[PDB]
Amino acid sequence: ELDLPYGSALTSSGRISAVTEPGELSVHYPFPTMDLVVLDDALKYGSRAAKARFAVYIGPLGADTAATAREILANVPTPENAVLLAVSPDQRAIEVVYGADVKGRGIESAAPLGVSAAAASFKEGNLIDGLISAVRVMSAGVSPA
Amino acid sequence: ELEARRPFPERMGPKGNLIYKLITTTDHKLIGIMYCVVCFAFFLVGGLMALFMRTELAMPGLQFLSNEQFNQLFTMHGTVMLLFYATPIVFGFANLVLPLQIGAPDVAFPRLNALSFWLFLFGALIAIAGFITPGGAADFGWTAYSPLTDAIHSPGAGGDLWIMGLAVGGLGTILGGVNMITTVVCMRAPGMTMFRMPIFTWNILVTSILVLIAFPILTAALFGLAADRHLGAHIYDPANGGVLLWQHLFWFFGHPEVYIIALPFFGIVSEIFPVFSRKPIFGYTTLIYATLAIAALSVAVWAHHMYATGAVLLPFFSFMTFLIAVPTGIKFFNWIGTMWKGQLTFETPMLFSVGFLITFLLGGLSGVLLASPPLDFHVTDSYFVIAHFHYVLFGTIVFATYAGIYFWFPKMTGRLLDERLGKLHFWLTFIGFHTTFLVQHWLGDEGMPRRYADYLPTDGFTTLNVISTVGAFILGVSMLPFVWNVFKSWRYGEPVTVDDPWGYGNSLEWATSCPPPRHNFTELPRIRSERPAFELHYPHMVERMRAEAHVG
Amino acid sequence: YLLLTFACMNDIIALKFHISLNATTWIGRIGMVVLPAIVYFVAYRWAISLQRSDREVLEHGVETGIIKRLPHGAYVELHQPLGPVDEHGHPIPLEYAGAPLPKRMNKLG
Amino acid sequence: MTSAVGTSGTAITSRVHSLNRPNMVSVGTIVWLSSELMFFAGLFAMYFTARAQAGGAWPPEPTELNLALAVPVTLVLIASSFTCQMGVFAAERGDVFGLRRWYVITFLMGLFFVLGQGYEYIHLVEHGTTIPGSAYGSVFYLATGFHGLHVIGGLVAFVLLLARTKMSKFTPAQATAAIVVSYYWHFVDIVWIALFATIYFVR
Amino acid sequence: MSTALTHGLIGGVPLVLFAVLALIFLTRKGPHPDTYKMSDPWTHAPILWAAEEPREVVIGGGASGKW
Amino acid sequence: MHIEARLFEILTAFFALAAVVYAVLTAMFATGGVEWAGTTALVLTTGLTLITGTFFRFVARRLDTRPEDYEDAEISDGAGELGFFAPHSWWPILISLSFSTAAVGAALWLPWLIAAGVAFVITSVCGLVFEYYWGPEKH
Amino acid sequence: MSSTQDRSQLDPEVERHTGVDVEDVPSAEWGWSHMPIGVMHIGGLLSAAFLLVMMRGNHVGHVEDWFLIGFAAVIVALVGRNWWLRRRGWIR
Ligand code: HEA
Ligand code: HEA
Ligand SMILES: CCCCCCCCCCCCCCCC(=O)O[C@H](COC(=O)CCCCCCC[C@@H](C)CCCCCCCCC)COP(=O)(O)O[C@H]1[C@H](O)[C@H](O)[C@H](O)[C@@H](O)[C@@H]1O
Ligand SMILES: [Cu+2]
Ligand SMILES: [Cu+2]
């Protein structure tokens, strides 16, 4: 068992209260603070006409990629209707994996077209804009129910 | 093994979660946010009122606005900087973080805090409402001396609206006084005694004591003045005893009012230091006695404002004003000991704290320089006294309120500020403020007395007024970074997930989430000493925290 | 309507509530153009927040006095649910039905 | 419903607790009582000067200051203090009816104090001083008249808490409300002992 | 004196000093980290960005690509 | 508790000391006589801290050590059920509107607005204080 | 606890597709709940145009025209900010 390596401690219940050195930050997301707001807008505001928690995964997946992406769809907080996108810039692999109840809801032609609309922007060199052009496409594709 | 978070938090919030929640506030948090918002709005109103005065004083003519509008201008300005900007924010930071600091779920009378805030706002609007009146608001000063306020003199409607606006604002701040003193007395976390509470809730304990001492005499004085104006009721009659009957009990309100102004901002700054000095507050029990040692005497010091009248017992109030200057000096040298041999970083709220230290220093040197009556017999109502109360009072409320905002901002809205923009804010509210008040010492010592609308070209000293105008308009464009910083730090700006966005936080506040939950606490820490958040977040520190906490 | 009425006693308002008569009829003359916009904004978002205030009394309970949690230091408001409860600290959240839902356990039994 | 989750004695709870815990509306009204004592300090300072000013036979010629109607209504008011304290004795022991009988008669003779003070004001203004007529007449009308506003606000608190006893079960919170209004009004008629010693006896 | 000077002074020296301090303090690099260069390897911890979109395991589908 | 009684005892000692020394130093040493306007203000600020400290001493004697106030007290030693705090309430905004109407009747000397604002104060104060005591509608 | 549940089958309805979603406003099917937003943009802009037309009249006090310019520039600033944020999708 190890907490955050300096300054954190688990409280009287399971909430682990941590710190942040005073000039530093908490999230350390290596993306600008305005285009991931555009990601959250494309993934919440212009997504609610699809009725599925669009997860986005950027971490490494250095294994059998489909299995290790559908394994990490299982902790998206409702896995039966979730359209996760997984991207590994260590590995150059897009992987859009669905939930159960998202099935035949305008989705089987939207996943390869979402991968194409993402990977047309990844090869330029825009991670966030690739994710936005993928989530907008899969929002236009997944029909609500 | 990995969480499932949003990429950025909620920017604005959903449509319609605040405006009914405005009307039906009951937690201390949102009420304190409303105090900070609407009182920085009144700070904006006052700042532009001062910039109108300072356009006026830039040239010896009456070139911009009249005489009477100027006499309304400094009066409404002195009120919406003292009794409608400072006086609310001394409970606005209380409603921010005092139930967070004492472990309280809410503030003790959670409707009467909404009642305090809304009585404040609707005393403030009906006191600003003199400007709608055609003769305007009160031309007599903030001091409002009684042969000038009785209805023969300044007979307009604006003075009456001023009177009843301060009646409502005083009642609301009395009610803030009672519910803050009852929080800190009997609504408190189960492990903390009287002494290991933070210093800031201690300063608001004694500040609410002096609010209950002072402000009912403002309402009593002012109900007597409203009767003396409308009923023609001879109480403050000048050929009666009624021009020291104003001065004695009005300044018996007034100087305890300026120390209920001064003490919780001392508490803010004394909370700023131990988390940026990365160490204890130096002499914590010394501060916990020194707040009483200044504030008990604050009541009994009141007539160091009537040195010029020649009708007060003069050595008594001069000796006790030196004796109220000594415990704030104690409270100051504890702060210099708190920065002493620490690992300082001057991220922005400590930078405002240090600006407060420098301004309140040389202003308090003017305090001991001014409280001696022969050195005041030329200086009573000069510009040395107006640069004195700016160079003290601005330093207390404005610098320590910017320290309080840039410190308790990521814990009252869960998002940081821009550090660069806050440093911009500080350096051109420091350079500009010293530009507009380091010269009014030398402008009130050579002659230019207070509350004048114009002066002469055959009088000298025009250049010191124009350099005060340069400094005041540096300070007028100084809050463009501040309102831009909070405007892009609520709806945007760098979020915090974990606690302590300022590391080495302490004082029992910083042991909950940065948007704190409704009723403030999911897990209280085991309170053992004055810094229980510092003892939660650093458990290995505790034996080193106590084993060297006594030498010096 | 309140503006066109409250600037028809323009005369006696500017008489008693000491305002310039020109000033209060300009206040009306701008008010009939901008105060419907202000009250539209406040009314629309206030209706939506009144909706949200009795759409959180279903997902949560009805608010009461505070109990602390026993082994640790917490503060829960001790919500009293309106419909069927589950086995834990949250009930089955009801659906809205156009009814005035009670927000005080006072108004319950 | 299932049963409830807030299974308490009422929707209202005491204020915290009062067996090993201080009552919080109690300490709230105590410090607000102390604030209103400073308000009366403002009124007393408006009295104790403008009596050092007037010299010689200083209560002026139209002020035939009636003590024979003053000391009966002070005796009414301070006996009514003991009626209100008997009401809070019957509030600790929890019956609404022992509370309501003693607070009804406390409200009635407090109303008798307000009507006696109003008749004293009529009888002292119709052949004497007015509030723009004298210095002493004005300070007499404000130092005791706004005390009339204090006691009429206390009467509003009595009738208001009596309707509150009509509308709900007698909780320990309502005994807290009763003891709070009880010694608010005890503060009112200890300030009136101070004012009656000051205006009439000491002068 | 010389009302053009004492108006241009009080209207420009605030804006001149504002421009100087805002060009020496806002041209610094902020605390926010740099944008992710795609050619650089993924140095960051793994990131999952959920949605909270309808508020409250078995496999659905698949797709893939190689940029 | 203990320490509030000691706190207002310190304030009572200083306020009584300052009151009596201001009275006996403006009895002599002044122009006309006793000032009577900060003297009685000091005597009744002694009265303020007498009331608060005497009540806190009355409570502190008729009490054990509070499980809040006790030094070296675990949180589980004092984790019970606190009393009622009010949730959401739209009466204080009405208190302020009522008292502001009464105040602008007392400022612009409008006795109809004084009486109407006092009537709204009584109505809204009733609405605040009965808010958690109105029973259900009996039909 | 002395309460019953409430169940109301209304005539629910454009028919539940275009407008505002039930998570933007918490009850959108229960009534009309979305003004089209070009109406309020052009309403604000026409309000400010009306305040600018209000200079034309019997008029010698030019202290009023600064209030008309002010309350017109505030409304033009709010409408322009609001339209610009929807043109960029609520950014800055
Ligand atoms: C924030 C509010 C504030 C504060 C804290 C002060 C703090 C002080 N003020 Fe100021 N003052 C006003 C706001 C303040 N004042 C206002 C609003 C007015 C009236 C407005 C008007 O009339 O126009 C005013 C009017 C005023 C007067 C009125 C006389 C006149 O009208 O000309 C006097 C003199 O008696 C005065 C003296 C002081 C003193 C001695 C302190 C002392 O507390 C300061 C002491 C601080 C230092 C002394 C300590 C630190 C320095 C060293 C590190 C240690 C000590 C060294 C010494 C021993 C030499 N003030
Ligand atoms: C509480 C402390 C305080 C504060 C903060 C202020 C704010 C300022 N004061 Fe004021 N002042 C007093 C304490 C303060 N004053 C007192 C006690 C009086 C005496 C009353 C009396 O004598 O009767 C007084 C009256 C006063 C005088 C009157 C003396 C005379 O008439 O000769 C002077 C001297 O020029 C003065 C200087 C300033 C300056 C430069 C500021 C600056 O901080 C300016 C602040 C305002 C701007 C920073 C705001 C920026 C403008 C906005 C951006 C405009 C747009 C906003 C709208 C959209 C809402 N003040
Ligand atoms: C119930 C609470 C209600 C609260 C409402 C509070 C009001 C809001 C602010 C009002 C500001 C008023 C400032 C007026 C100050 C003023 O006098 O300015 C006059 C004209 O200004 C003006 O009216 C312009 C201001 C217009 C205000 C904009 C309106 C805002 C709306 C939203 C408010 C409506 C509220 C209505 C409420 C109704 C109920 C609704 C629910 C200049 O003409 P005048 O004075 O005659 O001529 C001069 C010579 O005198 C002088 O010697 C000479 O020098 C020359 O100057 C000469 O021109
Ligand atoms: Cu002073
Ligand atoms: Cu003076």
PDB file of N, CA, C and O and ligand atoms in Angstrom, chain B residues 142-143 251 258-259 261-262 304-305 307 321 324-325 328-329 332-333 360-361 364 367-368 370-371 376 379-381 385 388-389 392-393 396 450, ligand 1:
ATOM      1  N   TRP B 142     -18.596  61.158   5.881  1.00  0.00           N
ATOM      2  CA  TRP B 142     -18.878  59.895   6.557  1.00  0.00           C
ATOM      3  C   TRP B 142     -18.957  60.084   8.063  1.00  0.00           C
ATOM      4  O   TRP B 142     -19.745  59.411   8.736  1.00  0.00           O
ATOM      5  N   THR B 143     -18.158  61.010   8.593  1.00  0.00           N
ATOM      6  CA  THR B 143     -18.155  61.308  10.017  1.00  0.00           C
ATOM      7  C   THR B 143     -19.498  61.859  10.476  1.00  0.00           C
ATOM      8  O   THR B 143     -19.930  61.581  11.600  1.00  0.00           O
ATOM      9  N   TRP B 251     -18.028  58.147  17.320  1.00  0.00           N
ATOM     10  CA  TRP B 251     -16.709  57.551  17.209  1.00  0.00           C
ATOM     11  C   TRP B 251     -16.528  56.365  18.138  1.00  0.00           C
ATOM     12  O   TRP B 251     -15.626  55.555  17.906  1.00  0.00           O
ATOM     13  N   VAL B 258     -13.759  50.408  12.802  1.00  0.00           N
ATOM     14  CA  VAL B 258     -12.556  50.200  12.002  1.00  0.00           C
ATOM     15  C   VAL B 258     -11.666  49.120  12.587  1.00  0.00           C
ATOM     16  O   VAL B 258     -10.833  48.559  11.867  1.00  0.00           O
ATOM     17  N   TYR B 259     -11.881  48.710  13.834  1.00  0.00           N
ATOM     18  CA  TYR B 259     -11.160  47.510  14.233  1.00  0.00           C
ATOM     19  C   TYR B 259     -11.928  46.217  13.991  1.00  0.00           C
ATOM     20  O   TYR B 259     -11.283  45.174  13.856  1.00  0.00           O
ATOM     21  N   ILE B 261     -13.231  46.059  11.195  1.00  0.00           N
ATOM     22  CA  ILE B 261     -12.609  46.026   9.882  1.00  0.00           C
ATOM     23  C   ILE B 261     -11.229  45.380   9.948  1.00  0.00           C
ATOM     24  O   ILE B 261     -10.902  44.498   9.150  1.00  0.00           O
ATOM     25  N   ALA B 262     -10.398  45.802  10.897  1.00  0.00           N
ATOM     26  CA  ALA B 262      -8.992  45.425  10.870  1.00  0.00           C
ATOM     27  C   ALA B 262      -8.703  44.012  11.352  1.00  0.00           C
ATOM     28  O   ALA B 262      -7.751  43.399  10.862  1.00  0.00           O
ATOM     29  N   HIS B 304      -9.931  59.318  20.117  1.00  0.00           N
ATOM     30  CA  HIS B 304      -8.736  59.847  19.484  1.00  0.00           C
ATOM     31  C   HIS B 304      -9.031  60.436  18.115  1.00  0.00           C
ATOM     32  O   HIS B 304      -8.116  60.597  17.306  1.00  0.00           O
ATOM     33  N   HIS B 305     -10.292  60.759  17.847  1.00  0.00           N
ATOM     34  CA  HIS B 305     -10.715  61.432  16.636  1.00  0.00           C
ATOM     35  C   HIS B 305     -11.110  62.876  16.887  1.00  0.00           C
ATOM     36  O   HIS B 305     -11.240  63.642  15.929  1.00  0.00           O
ATOM     37  N   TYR B 307      -9.347  65.182  18.758  1.00  0.00           N
ATOM     38  CA  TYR B 307      -8.260  65.973  19.310  1.00  0.00           C
ATOM     39  C   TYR B 307      -8.454  67.440  18.968  1.00  0.00           C
ATOM     40  O   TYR B 307      -8.205  68.318  19.799  1.00  0.00           O
ATOM     41  N   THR B 321      -4.330  55.266  22.948  1.00  0.00           N
ATOM     42  CA  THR B 321      -4.142  54.985  21.530  1.00  0.00           C
ATOM     43  C   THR B 321      -2.734  54.492  21.252  1.00  0.00           C
ATOM     44  O   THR B 321      -2.527  53.645  20.375  1.00  0.00           O
ATOM     45  N   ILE B 324      -3.200  50.891  22.231  1.00  0.00           N
ATOM     46  CA  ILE B 324      -3.776  50.038  21.183  1.00  0.00           C
ATOM     47  C   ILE B 324      -2.853  49.925  19.990  1.00  0.00           C
ATOM     48  O   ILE B 324      -3.085  49.077  19.117  1.00  0.00           O
ATOM     49  N   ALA B 325      -1.835  50.773  19.902  1.00  0.00           N
ATOM     50  CA  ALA B 325      -0.836  50.580  18.871  1.00  0.00           C
ATOM     51  C   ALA B 325       0.196  49.534  19.247  1.00  0.00           C
ATOM     52  O   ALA B 325       0.853  48.991  18.357  1.00  0.00           O
ATOM     53  N   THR B 328      -1.194  45.448  18.319  1.00  0.00           N
ATOM     54  CA  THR B 328      -1.105  45.184  16.891  1.00  0.00           C
ATOM     55  C   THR B 328       0.343  45.135  16.433  1.00  0.00           C
ATOM     56  O   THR B 328       0.661  44.422  15.479  1.00  0.00           O
ATOM     57  N   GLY B 329       1.243  45.826  17.134  1.00  0.00           N
ATOM     58  CA  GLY B 329       2.659  45.629  16.883  1.00  0.00           C
ATOM     59  C   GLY B 329       3.125  44.249  17.298  1.00  0.00           C
ATOM     60  O   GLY B 329       3.978  43.651  16.641  1.00  0.00           O
ATOM     61  N   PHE B 332       1.981  41.970  14.723  1.00  0.00           N
ATOM     62  CA  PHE B 332       2.804  42.119  13.539  1.00  0.00           C
ATOM     63  C   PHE B 332       4.149  41.405  13.676  1.00  0.00           C
ATOM     64  O   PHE B 332       4.628  40.769  12.725  1.00  0.00           O
ATOM     65  N   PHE B 333       4.814  41.561  14.822  1.00  0.00           N
ATOM     66  CA  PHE B 333       6.104  40.902  14.994  1.00  0.00           C
ATOM     67  C   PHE B 333       5.968  39.391  15.072  1.00  0.00           C
ATOM     68  O   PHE B 333       6.917  38.685  14.714  1.00  0.00           O
ATOM     69  N   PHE B 360       0.503  48.424   5.825  1.00  0.00           N
ATOM     70  CA  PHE B 360       0.068  48.544   7.209  1.00  0.00           C
ATOM     71  C   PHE B 360       1.209  48.942   8.129  1.00  0.00           C
ATOM     72  O   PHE B 360       0.962  49.603   9.137  1.00  0.00           O
ATOM     73  N   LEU B 361       2.455  48.586   7.794  1.00  0.00           N
ATOM     74  CA  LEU B 361       3.601  49.106   8.534  1.00  0.00           C
ATOM     75  C   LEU B 361       3.668  50.610   8.504  1.00  0.00           C
ATOM     76  O   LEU B 361       3.587  51.258   9.550  1.00  0.00           O
ATOM     77  N   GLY B 364       0.734  52.317   9.992  1.00  0.00           N
ATOM     78  CA  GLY B 364       0.698  52.313  11.443  1.00  0.00           C
ATOM     79  C   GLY B 364       1.768  53.170  12.081  1.00  0.00           C
ATOM     80  O   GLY B 364       1.593  53.637  13.216  1.00  0.00           O
ATOM     81  N   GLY B 367       0.168  56.021  12.270  1.00  0.00           N
ATOM     82  CA  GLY B 367      -0.770  55.921  13.380  1.00  0.00           C
ATOM     83  C   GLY B 367      -0.192  56.415  14.691  1.00  0.00           C
ATOM     84  O   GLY B 367      -0.794  57.248  15.370  1.00  0.00           O
ATOM     85  N   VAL B 368       0.977  55.895  15.071  1.00  0.00           N
ATOM     86  CA  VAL B 368       1.640  56.417  16.268  1.00  0.00           C
ATOM     87  C   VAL B 368       2.140  57.840  16.055  1.00  0.00           C
ATOM     88  O   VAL B 368       2.288  58.591  17.024  1.00  0.00           O
ATOM     89  N   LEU B 370       0.357  60.017  14.475  1.00  0.00           N
ATOM     90  CA  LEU B 370      -0.841  60.826  14.380  1.00  0.00           C
ATOM     91  C   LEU B 370      -1.650  60.832  15.664  1.00  0.00           C
ATOM     92  O   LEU B 370      -2.381  61.792  15.910  1.00  0.00           O
ATOM     93  N   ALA B 371      -1.521  59.801  16.493  1.00  0.00           N
ATOM     94  CA  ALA B 371      -2.274  59.684  17.733  1.00  0.00           C
ATOM     95  C   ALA B 371      -1.721  60.537  18.861  1.00  0.00           C
ATOM     96  O   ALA B 371      -2.318  60.562  19.940  1.00  0.00           O
ATOM     97  N   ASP B 376      -1.176  66.008  16.007  1.00  0.00           N
ATOM     98  CA  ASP B 376      -2.460  65.889  15.344  1.00  0.00           C
ATOM     99  C   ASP B 376      -3.172  67.226  15.229  1.00  0.00           C
ATOM    100  O   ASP B 376      -4.111  67.349  14.439  1.00  0.00           O
ATOM    101  N   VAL B 379      -2.842  68.109  11.943  1.00  0.00           N
ATOM    102  CA  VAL B 379      -3.031  67.001  11.027  1.00  0.00           C
ATOM    103  C   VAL B 379      -4.471  66.480  11.026  1.00  0.00           C
ATOM    104  O   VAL B 379      -4.896  65.902  10.011  1.00  0.00           O
ATOM    105  N   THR B 380      -5.259  66.760  12.079  1.00  0.00           N
ATOM    106  CA  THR B 380      -6.701  66.494  12.099  1.00  0.00           C
ATOM    107  C   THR B 380      -7.393  67.066  10.880  1.00  0.00           C
ATOM    108  O   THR B 380      -7.376  68.278  10.661  1.00  0.00           O
ATOM    109  N   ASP B 381      -7.930  66.152  10.073  1.00  0.00           N
ATOM    110  CA  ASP B 381      -8.661  66.424   8.839  1.00  0.00           C
ATOM    111  C   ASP B 381      -7.789  67.079   7.770  1.00  0.00           C
ATOM    112  O   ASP B 381      -8.275  67.859   6.953  1.00  0.00           O
ATOM    113  N   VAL B 385      -4.181  62.498   7.407  1.00  0.00           N
ATOM    114  CA  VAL B 385      -5.094  61.514   7.964  1.00  0.00           C
ATOM    115  C   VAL B 385      -5.808  60.734   6.857  1.00  0.00           C
ATOM    116  O   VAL B 385      -6.120  59.557   7.054  1.00  0.00           O
ATOM    117  N   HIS B 388      -3.331  58.325   5.754  1.00  0.00           N
ATOM    118  CA  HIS B 388      -3.194  57.389   6.856  1.00  0.00           C
ATOM    119  C   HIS B 388      -4.261  56.310   6.825  1.00  0.00           C
ATOM    120  O   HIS B 388      -3.936  55.120   6.874  1.00  0.00           O
ATOM    121  N   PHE B 389      -5.544  56.691   6.768  1.00  0.00           N
ATOM    122  CA  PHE B 389      -6.519  55.609   6.778  1.00  0.00           C
ATOM    123  C   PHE B 389      -6.592  54.868   5.452  1.00  0.00           C
ATOM    124  O   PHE B 389      -6.980  53.709   5.458  1.00  0.00           O
ATOM    125  N   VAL B 392      -3.349  52.473   5.767  1.00  0.00           N
ATOM    126  CA  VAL B 392      -3.646  51.385   6.693  1.00  0.00           C
ATOM    127  C   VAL B 392      -4.774  50.522   6.150  1.00  0.00           C
ATOM    128  O   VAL B 392      -4.622  49.315   5.957  1.00  0.00           O
ATOM    129  N   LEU B 393      -5.928  51.144   5.940  1.00  0.00           N
ATOM    130  CA  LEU B 393      -7.210  50.486   5.788  1.00  0.00           C
ATOM    131  C   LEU B 393      -7.350  49.777   4.455  1.00  0.00           C
ATOM    132  O   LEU B 393      -7.866  48.660   4.414  1.00  0.00           O
ATOM    133  N   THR B 396      -5.368  46.775   4.866  1.00  0.00           N
ATOM    134  CA  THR B 396      -6.043  45.693   5.569  1.00  0.00           C
ATOM    135  C   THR B 396      -7.074  45.050   4.664  1.00  0.00           C
ATOM    136  O   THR B 396      -6.844  43.936   4.188  1.00  0.00           O
ATOM    137  N   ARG B 450      -8.825  67.880   4.392  1.00  0.00           N
ATOM    138  CA  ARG B 450      -9.652  66.865   3.766  1.00  0.00           C
ATOM    139  C   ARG B 450     -10.982  67.453   3.326  1.00  0.00           C
ATOM    140  O   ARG B 450     -11.387  68.532   3.765  1.00  0.00           O
TER     141      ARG B 450
HETATM  142  C1  HEA H   1      -8.696  49.724   9.010  1.00  0.00           C
HETATM  143  C2  HEA H   1      -8.981  50.786   9.736  1.00  0.00           C
HETATM  144  C3  HEA H   1      -7.981  51.590  10.581  1.00  0.00           C
HETATM  145  C4  HEA H   1      -6.990  51.148  11.378  1.00  0.00           C
HETATM  146  C5  HEA H   1      -6.546  49.699  11.664  1.00  0.00           C
HETATM  147  C6  HEA H   1      -6.458  52.375  11.855  1.00  0.00           C
HETATM  148  C7  HEA H   1      -5.249  51.861  12.825  1.00  0.00           C
HETATM  149  C8  HEA H   1      -4.837  53.267  13.599  1.00  0.00           C
HETATM  150  N1  HEA H   1      -5.349  54.554  13.345  1.00  0.00           N
HETATM  151 FE1  HEA H   1      -6.541  55.294  11.946  1.00  0.00          FE
HETATM  152  N2  HEA H   1      -8.241  55.775  11.289  1.00  0.00           N
HETATM  153  C9  HEA H   1      -9.123  55.138  10.439  1.00  0.00           C
HETATM  154  C10 HEA H   1      -9.094  53.567   9.777  1.00  0.00           C
HETATM  155  C11 HEA H   1      -7.878  52.985  10.722  1.00  0.00           C
HETATM  156  N3  HEA H   1      -7.001  53.549  11.577  1.00  0.00           N
HETATM  157  C12 HEA H   1     -10.316  55.776  10.061  1.00  0.00           C
HETATM  158  C13 HEA H   1     -11.435  55.228   9.180  1.00  0.00           C
HETATM  159  C14 HEA H   1     -10.220  57.004  10.632  1.00  0.00           C
HETATM  160  C15 HEA H   1     -11.222  58.185  10.645  1.00  0.00           C
HETATM  161  C16 HEA H   1     -11.775  58.847   9.381  1.00  0.00           C
HETATM  162  C17 HEA H   1     -11.786  60.371   9.497  1.00  0.00           C
HETATM  163  O1  HEA H   1     -11.872  60.904  10.632  1.00  0.00           O
HETATM  164  O2  HEA H   1     -11.698  61.103   8.472  1.00  0.00           O
HETATM  165  C18 HEA H   1      -8.953  56.889  11.312  1.00  0.00           C
HETATM  166  C19 HEA H   1      -8.770  58.320  12.037  1.00  0.00           C
HETATM  167  C20 HEA H   1      -7.431  58.000  13.000  1.00  0.00           C
HETATM  168  C21 HEA H   1      -7.183  59.019  13.889  1.00  0.00           C
HETATM  169  C22 HEA H   1      -8.047  60.280  14.022  1.00  0.00           C
HETATM  170  C23 HEA H   1      -7.427  61.661  14.162  1.00  0.00           C
HETATM  171  C24 HEA H   1      -7.729  62.571  12.981  1.00  0.00           C
HETATM  172  O3  HEA H   1      -8.895  62.643  12.517  1.00  0.00           O
HETATM  173  O4  HEA H   1      -6.803  63.246  12.471  1.00  0.00           O
HETATM  174  C25 HEA H   1      -6.084  58.589  14.573  1.00  0.00           C
HETATM  175  C26 HEA H   1      -5.311  59.268  15.700  1.00  0.00           C
HETATM  176  O5  HEA H   1      -5.641  59.077  16.818  1.00  0.00           O
HETATM  177  C27 HEA H   1      -5.823  57.345  13.945  1.00  0.00           C
HETATM  178  C28 HEA H   1      -4.492  56.784  14.736  1.00  0.00           C
HETATM  179  C29 HEA H   1      -4.556  55.173  14.319  1.00  0.00           C
HETATM  180  C30 HEA H   1      -3.736  54.362  15.140  1.00  0.00           C
HETATM  181  C31 HEA H   1      -2.834  54.765  16.292  1.00  0.00           C
HETATM  182  C32 HEA H   1      -3.914  53.073  14.678  1.00  0.00           C
HETATM  183  C33 HEA H   1      -3.148  51.877  15.265  1.00  0.00           C
HETATM  184  O6  HEA H   1      -3.897  50.723  15.485  1.00  0.00           O
HETATM  185  C34 HEA H   1      -1.984  51.541  14.323  1.00  0.00           C
HETATM  186  C35 HEA H   1      -0.819  50.848  15.013  1.00  0.00           C
HETATM  187  C36 HEA H   1       0.013  49.955  14.084  1.00  0.00           C
HETATM  188  C37 HEA H   1       1.540  49.999  14.258  1.00  0.00           C
HETATM  189  C38 HEA H   1       1.966  50.980  15.353  1.00  0.00           C
HETATM  190  C39 HEA H   1       2.060  48.607  14.618  1.00  0.00           C
HETATM  191  C40 HEA H   1       3.208  48.090  13.740  1.00  0.00           C
HETATM  192  C41 HEA H   1       4.484  48.939  13.744  1.00  0.00           C
HETATM  193  C42 HEA H   1       5.688  48.346  14.485  1.00  0.00           C
HETATM  194  C43 HEA H   1       6.088  47.044  13.805  1.00  0.00           C
HETATM  195  C44 HEA H   1       5.409  48.060  15.962  1.00  0.00           C
HETATM  196  C45 HEA H   1       5.026  49.309  16.755  1.00  0.00           C
HETATM  197  C46 HEA H   1       6.074  50.418  16.677  1.00  0.00           C
HETATM  198  C47 HEA H   1       5.608  51.645  17.450  1.00  0.00           C
HETATM  199  C48 HEA H   1       5.688  51.348  18.941  1.00  0.00           C
HETATM  200  C49 HEA H   1       6.419  52.886  17.083  1.00  0.00           C
HETATM  201  N4  HEA H   1      -6.622  56.866  13.022  1.00  0.00           N
END
